[PDB]
Structures are given as structure tokens and as C-alpha cells.
């Protein structure tokens, strides 16, 4: 935990009761702050699909299963059942 | 089945309503909306005897709680009506009297921006207070916004509204929006209703507003699942660019600040967090599709 | 990207509502005239029918093909 | 069964009388709150439009999942005749009652109401000291005279007459006393809201020639009144009605102005605990209650031994249970009172036993019992002891000339459900005294 | 197209219409991909 977190020793936690364990698990949900000297800045290409409402079912490009409604990708028009997921065709989030 | 709490976020401001009167042929249309609200709240009180009502007015220089009045009277409503109804309506109209007088004194004050965000946030806090204080109560929000007035910049409104959407969703507090004005759709308020199982309605004419209120925005939280909402518009859940300002279908977002960018920012640097992107990596996006030579 | 009211007008309009509120308030006038209620109901249902059709068909769904 | 009881009474009223009942906005508002949530939603939509909506349109609003609730809502509204189904031009049109629509419109919009909600004299009185004490004592007195405990001030003849003729507190002149019945114990068990309606509903049936609508009119608006306020005085029938209302501790009069009380407001379906007691293996009762009413009801089936200021301690005995059983109280009712008046401690220990039971074997999930099962078994066993002998009154048949005649006579008795016992070997059968004439009549025929 | 024709003659329009609707989104997606390839090929090549 220490050598892997730039020497910080606060990432190895030992509980003292069941109540504290829930707190320890909950604390991990929040994003972990990044280190200054670890720079990975970049731009990620992702699109915002538009929901549809069709009368008849159609096959989904992700599971090959018939689903009534889905979101159309703005790059290849393939439909995905749920979000957020990587498009199964163009690999665009 | 169970008592429900109704919190009406009415956005009243002479600038918003005066423009509505000028564009149309109706003078003093605020009375018609105000009169409809009084009957609408009474209708909600008539649904059950254990339900409460709250009204928050977003005036030019801030927000104020019309009902319940703070612990810190003119005759405007007949005294022969039901006691509970008058106990709320009389206070509601009286606060309107005081609020207009306060607004009139500060008429020359510069109203830089709208205060709808605060009222919606304030309403959610009131909803939380009642739910925990009384123990097993449902909640609902109703936003009466006058969009006729030409807004200056709506971008600031985006962040507070999105935060309110998550809070309402967590607390199971559907929020309905009733819009009176020129613009047919509000990209933010309409988005709020869909994401929170609410009802969005737009009416051009103030007259006959009660029919809409009693027929569309009268679905109590107890029977929400069994009633199909009358909303007609559709939402794309898209956000405008930070430089062009247009809706982006496919674009780029910064890894650090999550700022949408339709095109590569000038200077190869983020315009929102001043983060420099790698020249090689951005060149990857710039590469054109592969085609046989 | 795909008339402004003067300061006096707001004061003038504010006075009109100020007088219309203090003098008296009639809630019974809120009822429609029976000529716009039909129009209001006709358009409201128009969305109900579309929504009802959408919501009636909102594991795999049953199919008709063999 | 509160909304069911009030609603059911309204359905039995003829439609001709219902139309006159909906004249006042006050009663219409009270009746509006009784319908199911879906019914209220449709009513509110229809009140403010003076037009006709086809039936199918209202069905479109309801989602597929909530389709079942639509059937109950429309059925309830139609039975009360609030909704008038009109068919014309090949379509079944739907409209709202003109009187009901106008009545609701006035109440919501503050139109002319003809003083249905009453007037204000601006002469208020302290609610806690006077209104609460008067109604509590008056309601306390009638309850004591019903549970049988001695009390100095017996109730007036009016309420006394109502109680007797009703199933409550059956009385016999030969016995010279009044005792509780099976329904009486249930009446005590029912919460205050249902307790009050039972007496009021019985009174509504008792009145004769006093108009049924007028009594209903007065009762409904009484709840609309707010406690701790004055209300000046009304119909001629409502005058004698108002005085009779004082007998039940719902309205207080000094000797022109009448003040509603907590019970009056509670009437219109308004939304450690006192009475909690400890039941344990030793058949010892420790009721943490300080109130004569709670003490009196407990004594019906508990042999009290002593009382402290904080609580009353007693013991369950075979004599005590038999005394309640003889009157007509069922054992199932007794356990319900014990279960619903349990001590918080009992639940925790029972839950702890459940948690250990789940720990050892979580495959079994039986309904938890707050009080030890041994008390339940003994109480029910005592009930079996009282039902040890079962006897029926009637007559016996014998000496049938032909077997066919015996079979024919016996078969008919079974058909009309009057045959109790029969033996083919002896060619004998016994029939109840109630159906004795029917069997004899068939014998002649 | 061949499958639709095969179903069309075999089922006589009783199933072809339903079959086309099920496969419409994928058919449009592949057509769009070819259209994009054809459109861009003209530009870069010429
Ligand atoms: Zn899928
Ligand atoms: Zn895609
Ligand atoms: Zn950035």
C-alpha cells in the first residue's frame, strides 16, 4: 500500500468493528486524488446518443437480442440497450 | 394512500412577466396564474386532510417562503370558505402583497441573473425537513416558470439544476415544470422532469390554466406508477459546447475537468482547467479515416 | 446557438397587479368558458394516446416469427 | 373498515336521496375524501370543466400495471351515483353530477356556500383545559357504563336507548343488568376513529321521521369545523340533533354557540404506549397503564390483584377467562388484545429467539409471537372446555313404513340444509328445531 | 436482401414485413458504413 501510493501509508486500513467496516467500504467509492507528477492529461472521444421509441422490437448490436427501445450511437447508428457502455461497433463510449 | 407534500416553486418577477404581457394582449396575467395557483393548492388540500403545502417565490433579488409564513391582516379572500383553505390562501396572498412592495422599492436594482436555482434547491431542503421530522410522507415539486422574458445567460443554471436532479431522484421527489412563455422547450427544466419521473408542460395562454394544473400536474406521488404522464416533448440529454456553444453529438471531453468540447481547443490546451494535452495524443484524434491509396 | 421592457413599464404593470390584488380577488373566475376547455382537453389527450401506445410495450420479448 | 362502513351506508341510500345530500359543499368535500385515490384524481379533473368526456379517455390515463385499480375506482364512483354514465351517438359518454360539480366548485373557488361551514363568533376557549377534559370525561363515562364497571353518572336515555337496541351491550330486564357481547369487545378493540363511527352509524339507522340527509349533513360539516373555535347557530331538525350530540362528548355547550372538540375533528378520517402489558409464563399480568378505562377493560378477563400509580398488576386465571367466554368474548379476540397491547421488551426477546432460530436454521420463517405460546394454548384450551358440550334443539324421526320414504324425506332435509344427523341402520335422523316445520311440511307433501 | 426475398416468396409477405423491421437497424448501419466509405474514397483519392 505504501510503495504503490507514492509512499502514503493511509491506504492500509484495519477495522475495529462492523460499523467501521461499512465506513471503510463507503470511503472507497469516492475518486482517489491524483499525484502531481503523474500527468496523463488527454482528450477522450465519446458521444451523446439520442433515445428512441420504436413501435416494433429490433435486435441489439451488443447482445444480439430483441429489445423495444434503445439509444442510437451518433457515429455508426447502432443501438445499445443501456448506458454508459462502449459502443459494440465503433468502440466509442 | 398516504399523505403527500406539494412544494410549488413559483418564479415571479416583473421583468419576466412584463415581457409576457407586452408580447401578448393580456395585461396583468400574473393574477390569472396567481388565481389558478390558489385553487390548485386548495385542490391539493382537498385530496387529503393530512397533506401540507409549501410555496417559495423566486423574486429578483433572492427567494422567499410564501407559505408557511415565518413566525417573525388585509382582506383579500372571502371568509366564508373552508378554514384550512383560507388559512393557506390568506397567508399566500398577504406575502405576495409584501413581496411586491419589497420588489417595488428595489425596482431600480440591477437584476443580473435569475434565481430559479436557489428556489429549487430551497424546496428540496424543505422537502427533506418535513419527511424526517414527521414519521412516511411523500413529496413533489412544482415549478411555475415564466420563460417569456429573454434570459441573459442560462449556462449558470445548468450546474445547480443537474445537482438538484440527483437529490430529487434519491429522495423519490418527482418535480413537474409548468412553463408559460414564448419558447416551446426548455433544455434544462424539461430535462429535469424526464430524469425525475416528472411532468413538463408548456402553455402559451394564461387563461384556463386550472384545467392543465388539475389534469396534468395533479398526479400525487401515491399513484405515479399507474398514471401515464401527458408530456409530449422528447429529451436528448445533451450539453452545449464550451466554445462554439452548440449541441455536440460526438466530441471530446477533458480527462481532468470533464468539459465537453466539440472541436480541439485552440492552443492544444483545455479552456476550462488550463491543462495542456499531449501533442502526440491529440494528433491521434486529428488523424483522418484510413482509405486505400 | 442554433422587445426589452423599460424600467417604468415594470413599475406601471406592478401597480396594476397591486391594485387588482388589494381591491378584490375572485377565484370563481378561474373556471374556463367551456370553449377553451374542450381545446385544452383535446390536446392533452393527444399526448396521452401517444404516451399510452409508447408505454404499453416499454429474458427476451415474445416474438411472432418461427 | 372506516371508509368501507361510511361508503357502504351511502350506497344503500336511494339515488333520489343522494342527489339532495350533495346540495351542501361541506358534505361533498367530506365524501370526496372517502373515494379511492384514483377516483379523486378523475373527479378533480372533471369538476373544473363543463363538458362531456367519453369513457375510454379516462381509461387511457391508467397504465397497464394499474389497470386493476381502475375497475375498483369506477365501480365505487358509479355506485354513489356521483358519475352519471350517458350513452348517445353510439358512444358511452361520461359526465359528473351537476349538483356535485357545483358543490365542489364553490368550496374550492370560495363561491356562495350558504354558511355550510358555519360562522365565527371570535369567542374562543382554552382547548386543553376545557374541550379536551369535557369530551374525554363524557366519552370516558359512556365507555365505563359499557364495560360494566360501576360509575356514578350513568349516561342519558338517548345514548342508552341506542346502545341497547344495537348489538352493543346486550341487556335483559329479567337479569336486570347490562353485559358486553362479542361485537362489544370488538368495538372496544377498534381505534377511537372507528369507535366513534359505529355509534354514529347506528344512530343514523335509529332516527325515524328528523331527515336522514339532515343528520348526515350535520355530521359531515361537524368534522370540517376546527377545534378551539366558536360557531354560532341551522335546520330545525339540526337543533335537537345538536343537543343529542352533547351526550356523546362531541360538542360542548355552556347552556347559542357550540364548540367542536378533538373527537369532532377526528371524525373526518383524520390520520411507552399506554395500555402495554407483560404476559409471561406464570400467567401474571403487569399493565403499564394508568387510566380507569384501561383497567376496566382488562378486568373483563383478568383477575386483578392490586394496583400502583404507575401500573396495575394482576393474574390470568381459569375463572377470569371463563367469565369473558360466557358473556360472548371469543378467545381469538382476547389474544388479539394481548398481542396489540404488548410490551416493547417482549418483542425484542421474541426477535432474539427468532434471530437465534434463523441462525441455527434460516430455512423456517414462522410468524413471530410476542407473548409466550403457552399462554395462547391454555387460553384456547379453556375455550375448548366451554365448547365441550354441543347441543341442538329439534325433533327425531323414526318408524318409516318404506325405506324409499325415509331416503326421500332425509334427502330433502339435506337439500334445504336442515338435516343434522342420520343413521341408516336405525332408519333415524335428527333435524334442527329451526327446520322442523320444513321437514314436516315436506312429509305431508 | 436475399434472405428477405427468400422469406418473401416462402411466406408471401406474411413474414417479410416483420423480418425487415427486425433487421432494419443493422441494414441501415451497414449501408451507412458503405456510404461513408464510398463518400470519403472519392475525396481522398481524388
Ligand atoms: Zn443488447
Ligand atoms: Zn457506435
Ligand atoms: Zn480540462
From Swiss-Prot, chain A:
UniProt subcellular location: Nucleus
**From which residue to which do the C4-type zinc fingers run?**
73-90
Task: Spell out where the chain crosses the membrane.
Answer: none
Per the entry, what this protein does is: Component of the general transcription and DNA repair factor IIH (TFIIH) core complex, which is involved in general and transcription-coupled nucleotide excision repair (NER) of damaged DNA and, when complexed to TFIIK, in RNA transcription by RNA polymerase II. In NER, TFIIH acts by opening DNA around the lesion to allow the excision of the damaged oligonucleotide and its replacement by a new DNA fragment. In transcription, TFIIH has an essential role in transcription initiation.
- Protein family (similarity comment): Belongs to the GTF2H2 family.
Subunit-structure text: Component of the 7-subunit TFIIH core complex composed of XPB/SSL2, XPD/RAD3, SSL1, TFB1, TFB2, TFB4 and TFB5, which is active in NER. The core complex associates with the 3-subunit CTD-kinase module TFIIK composed of CCL1, KIN28 and TFB3 to form the 10-subunit holoenzyme (holo-TFIIH) active in transcription. An additionnal subunit, TFB6, plays a role in the dissociation of the SSL2 helicase from TFIIH after transcription initiation.
The UniProt record's further free-text remark is: Present with 2340 molecules/cell in log phase SD medium.
Q: Quote the protein name from its UniProt record.
A: General transcription and DNA repair factor IIH subunit SSL1
Parent-record interval covered: 277 to 369 of 461
Swiss-Prot record, chain B:
Entry GO terms, CC: nucleotide-excision repair factor 3 complex; transcription factor TFIIH core complex; transcription factor TFIIH holo complex
Q: Give the organism the record lists.
A: Saccharomyces cerevisiae (strain ATCC 204508 / S288c)
Q: Where are the zinc fingers (C4-type)?
A: 254-273
The molecular function terms of the Gene Ontology recorded here are: zinc ion binding
Q: Which cysteines are joined by disulfide bonds?
A: none
**UniProt protein name:** General transcription and DNA repair factor IIH subunit TFB4
Which top-rank group of organisms is this from? Eukaryota
The entry's localization annotation reads: Nucleus
Quaternary data: Component of the 7-subunit TFIIH core complex composed of XPB/SSL2, XPD/RAD3, SSL1, TFB1, TFB2, TFB4 and TFB5, which is active in NER. The core complex associates with the 3-subunit CTD-kinase module TFIIK composed of CCL1, KIN28 and TFB3 to form the 10-subunit holoenzyme (holo-TFIIH) active in transcription. An additionnal subunit, TFB6, plays a role in the dissociation of the SSL2 helicase from TFIIH after transcription initiation.
Recall the taxonomic lineage recorded for the source organism. Eukaryota, Fungi, Dikarya, Ascomycota, Saccharomycotina
NCBIfam families assigned: tfb4
**Which family does this protein fall into?**
Belongs to the TFB4 family.
What keyword terms does UniProt attach to this protein? Acetylation, DNA damage, DNA repair, Metal-binding, Nucleus, Transcription, Transcription regulation, Zinc, Zinc-finger
The record, for Pfam families, names: Tfb4
Where does it primarily localize?
Answer: nucleus
Q: Name one GO biological process term.
A: nucleotide-excision repair
Gene3D superfamilies given for it? von Willebrand factor, type A domain
Tell me which InterPro entries the record gives. Answer: TFIIH_Tfb4/GTF2H3 (IPR004600), vWFA_dom_sf (IPR036465)
UniProtKB/Swiss-Prot annotation, chain C:
Instruction: Tell me where on the tree of life, at the top rank, the source sits.
Output: Eukaryota
**Location within or outside the cell:** Nucleus
**Any extra remark in the record?**
Present with 5150 molecules/cell in log phase SD medium.
Biological role: Component of the general transcription and DNA repair factor IIH (TFIIH) core complex, which is involved in general and transcription-coupled nucleotide excision repair (NER) of damaged DNA and, when complexed to TFIIK, in RNA transcription by RNA polymerase II. In NER, TFIIH acts by opening DNA around the lesion to allow the excision of the damaged oligonucleotide and its replacement by a new DNA fragment. In transcription, TFIIH has an essential role in transcription initiation.
Oligomer status and interactors: Component of the 7-subunit TFIIH core complex composed of XPB/SSL2, XPD/RAD3, SSL1, TFB1, TFB2, TFB4 and TFB5, which is active in NER. The core complex associates with the 3-subunit CTD-kinase module TFIIK composed of CCL1, KIN28 and TFB3 to form the 10-subunit holoenzyme (holo-TFIIH) active in transcription. An additionnal subunit, TFB6, plays a role in the dissociation of the SSL2 helicase from TFIIH after transcription initiation. TFB1 interacts with XPC/RAD4. XPC/RAD4 recruits TFIIH to the NER machinery. Interacts with the NER 3'-endonuclease XPG/RAD2.
Q: Which family does it belong to?
A: Belongs to the TFB1 family.
What's the protein name? General transcription and DNA repair factor IIH subunit TFB1
UniProtKB/Swiss-Prot annotation, chain D:
Q: Which domain of life is it from?
A: Eukaryota
- Bilayer-crossing regions: none
Gene Ontology annotations for the cellular component aspect, listed alphabetically: nucleotide-excision repair factor 3 complex; transcription factor TFIIH core complex; transcription factor TFIIH holo complex
The entry describes its oligomerization and partners as: Component of the 7-subunit TFIIH core complex composed of XPB/SSL2, XPD/RAD3, SSL1, TFB1, TFB2, TFB4 and TFB5, which is active in NER. The core complex associates with the 3-subunit CTD-kinase module TFIIK composed of CCL1, KIN28 and TFB3 to form the 10-subunit holoenzyme (holo-TFIIH) active in transcription. An additionnal subunit, TFB6, plays a role in the dissociation of the SSL2 helicase from TFIIH after transcription initiation. Interacts with TFB5.
Which family does the record assign? Belongs to the TFB2 family.
As a miscellaneous remark, the entry gives: Present with 8900 molecules/cell in log phase SD medium.
- By what name is this protein known? General transcription and DNA repair factor IIH subunit TFB2
Q: Species name for this entry?
A: Saccharomyces cerevisiae (strain ATCC 204508 / S288c)
Amino acid at each position: 500500500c505504501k510503495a504503490t501510493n507514492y509512499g502514503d501509508e493511509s491506504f492500509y486500513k484495519i477495522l475495529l468493528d462492523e460499523t467501521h467496516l461499512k465506513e471503510l467500504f463507503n470511503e472507497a467509492v469516492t475518486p482517489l486524488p491524483v499525484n502531481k507528477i503523474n500527468k496523463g492529461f488527454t482528450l477522450v472521444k465519446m458521444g451523446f446518443p439520442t433515445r428512441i421509441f420504436e413501435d416494433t422490437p429490433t435486435f441489439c448490436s451488443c447482445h444480439s437480442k430483441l429489445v423495444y427501445g434503445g439509444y442510437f450511437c451518433p457515429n455508426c447508428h447502432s443501438k445499445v440497450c443501456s448506458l454508459p457502455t462502449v459502443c459494440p461497433c465503433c468502440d466509442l463510449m | 394512500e398516504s399523505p403527500s407534500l406539494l412544494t410549488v416553486i413559483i418564479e415571479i418577477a416583473p421583468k419576466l412577466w412584463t415581457t409576457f404581457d407586452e408580447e401578448g394582449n393580456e395585461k396583468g396575467s400574473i393574477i390569472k396564474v396567481l388565481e389558478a395557483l390558489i385553487v390548485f393548492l386548495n385542490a391539493h388540500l382537498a385530496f387529503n386532510s393530512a397533506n401540507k403545502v409549501a410555496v417559495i417565490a423566486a423574486y429578483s433579488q433572492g427567494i422567499k417562503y410564501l407559505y408557511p409564513e415565518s413566525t417573525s391582516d388585509l382582506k383579500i379572500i372571502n371568509s366564508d370558505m373552508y378554514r384550512r383553505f383560507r388559512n393557506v390562501d390568506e397567508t399566500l396572498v398577504e406575502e405576495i402583497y409584501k413581496l411586491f412592495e419589497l420588489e417595488k422599492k428595489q425596482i431600480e436594482q440591477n437584476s443580473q441573473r435569475s434565481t430559479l436555482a436557489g428556489a429549487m434547491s430551497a424546496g428540496l431542503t424543505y422537502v427533506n425537513r418535513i419527511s424526517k421530522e414527521s414519521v412516511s410522507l411523500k413529496s413533489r415539486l412544482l415549478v411555475l416558470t415564466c420563460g417569456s422574458g429573454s434570459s441573459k445567460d442560462e449556462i449558470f443554471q445548468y450546474i445547480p439544476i443537474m445537482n438538484c436532479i440527483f437529490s430529487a431522484t434519491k429522495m423519490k421527489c418527482p418535480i413537474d415544470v409548468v412553463k408559460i412563455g414564448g419558447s416551446k422547450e426548455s433544455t434544462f427544466l424539461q430535462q429535469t422532469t424526464d430524469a425525475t419521473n416528472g411532468v413538463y408542460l408548456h402553455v402559451e395562454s394564461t387563461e384556463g390554466l386550472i384545467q392543465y394544473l388539475a389534469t396534468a400536474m395533479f398526479i400525487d406521488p401515491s399513484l405515479r406508477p399507474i398514471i401515464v404522464k401527458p408530456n409530449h416533448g422528447s429529451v436528448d440529454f445533451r450539453t452545449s459546447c464550451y466554445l462554439t456553444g452548440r449541441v455536440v453529438a460526438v466530441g471530446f471531453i477533458c480527462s481532468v475537468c470533464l468539459c465537453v468540447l466539440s472541436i480541439i481547443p485552440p492552443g492544444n490546451k483545455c479552456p476550462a482547467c488550463d491543462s495542456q494535452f499531449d501533442e502526440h495524443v491529440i494528433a491521434k484524434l486529428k488523424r483522418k479515416p484510413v482509405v486505400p491509396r | 446557438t442554433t422587445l426589452k421592457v423599460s424600467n417604468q413599464q415594470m413599475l406601471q404593470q406592478l401597480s396594476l397587479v397591486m391594485d387588482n390584488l388589494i381591491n378584490k380577488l375572485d377565484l370563481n373566475q378561474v373556471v374556463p368558458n367551456n370553449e377553451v376547455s374542450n381545446k385544452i382537453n383535446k390536446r392533452v389527450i393527444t399526448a396521452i394516446k401517444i404516451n399510452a401506445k409508447q408505454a404499453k410495450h416499454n429474458l427476451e420479448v415474445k416474438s411472432t416469427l418461427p | 373498515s372506516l371508509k368501507h362502513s361510511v361508503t357502504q351506508y351511502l350506497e344503500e341510500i336511494p339515488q333520489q336521496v343522494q342527489n339532495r345530500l350533495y346540495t351542501s359543499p361541506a358534505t361533498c368535500l367530506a365524501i370526496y375524501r372517502i373515494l379511492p385515490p384514483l377516483a379523486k384524481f378523475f373527479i378533480m379533473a372533471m369538476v373544473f370543466n363543463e363538458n362531456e368526456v367519453p369513457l375510454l379517455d379516462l381509461d387511457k390515463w391508467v397504465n397497464s400495471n394499474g389497470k386493476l385499480q381502475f375497475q375498483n375506482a369506477i365501480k365505487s364512483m358509479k355506485s354513489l351515483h356521483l358519475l352519471i354514465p350517458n350513452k348517445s351517438s353510439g358512444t358511452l359518454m361520461i359526465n359528473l353530477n351537476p349538483t356535485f360539480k357545483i358543490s365542489l366548485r364553490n368550496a374550492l373557488t370560495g363561491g356562495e356556500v350558504q354558511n355550510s361551514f358555519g360562522v365565527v363568533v371570535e369567542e374562543n376557549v382554552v382547548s386543553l383545559d376545557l374541550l379536551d377534559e369535557y369530551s374525554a370525561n363524557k366519552w370516558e363515562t359512556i365507555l365505563h357504563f359499557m364495560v360494566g364497571t360501576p360509575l356514578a353518572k350513568i349516561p342519558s336515555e338517548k345514548v342508552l336507548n341506542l346502545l341497547k337496541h344495537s348489538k352493543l351491550m346486550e341487556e335483559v330486564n329479567s337479569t336486570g343488568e347490562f353485559k358486553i357481547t362479542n361485537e362489544g369487545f370488538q368495538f372496544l378493540l377498534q381505534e377511537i376513529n372507528s369507535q366513534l363511527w359505529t355509534l354514529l352509524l347506528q344512530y343514523l339507522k335509529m332516527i325515524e321521521t328528523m331527515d336522514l340527509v339532515d343528520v348526515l349533513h350535520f355530521i359531515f360539516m361537524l368534522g370540517a369545523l376546527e377545534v378551539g373555535k366558536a360557531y354560532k347557530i341551522l335546520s330545525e331538525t339540526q337543533r335537537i340533533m345538536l343537543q343529542d350530540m352533547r351526550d356523546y362528548g362531541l360538542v360542548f355547550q355552556k347552556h347559542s354557540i357550540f364548540y367542536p372538540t378533538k373527537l369532532a375533528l377526528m371524525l373526518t378520517s383524520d390520520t411507552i404506549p399506554d395500555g402495554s402489558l407483560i404476559v409471561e409464563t406464570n400467567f401474571k399480568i403487569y399493565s403499564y397503564s394508568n387510566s380507569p378505562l384501561q383497567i376496566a377493560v382488562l378486568s373483563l378477563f383478568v383477575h386483578l390483584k392490586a394496583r400502583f400509580v404507575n401500573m396495575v398488576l394482576g393474574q390470568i386465571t381459569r375463572e377470569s377467562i371463563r367469565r369473558a367466554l360466557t358473556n360472548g368474548i371469543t378467545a381469538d379476540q382476547i389474544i388479539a388484545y394481548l398481542e396489540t397491547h404488548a410490551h416493547p421488551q417482549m418483542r425484542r426477546l421474541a426477535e432474539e429467539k427468532l434471530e437465534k432460530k434463523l441462525e441455527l436454521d434460516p430455512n423456517c420463517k414462522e410468524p413471530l409471537q410476542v407473548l409466550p405460546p403457552t399462554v395462547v394454548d391454555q387460553i384456547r384450551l379453556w375455550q375448548l372446555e366451554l365448547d365441550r358440550v354441543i347441543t341442538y334443539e329439534g325433533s327425531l324421526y323414526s318408524d318409516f313404513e318404506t325405506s324409499q320414504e325415509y331416503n326421500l324425506l332425509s334427502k330433502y332435509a339435506q337439500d334445504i340444509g336442515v338435516l343434522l344427523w342420520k343413521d341408516d341402520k336405525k332408519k333415524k335422523f335428527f333435524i334442527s328445531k329451526e327446520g322442523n316445520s320444513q321437514v314436516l311440511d315436506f312429509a305431508k307433501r | 436482401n436475399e434472405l428477405f426475398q427468400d422469406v418473401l416468396n416462402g411466406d408471401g409477405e406474411s413474414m417479410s414485413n416483420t423480418c425487415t423491421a427486425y433487421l432494419k437497424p443493422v441494414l441501415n448501419s451497414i449501408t451507412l458504413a458503405t456510404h461513408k466509405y464510398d463518400e470519403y474514397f472519392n475525396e481522398y483519392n481524388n
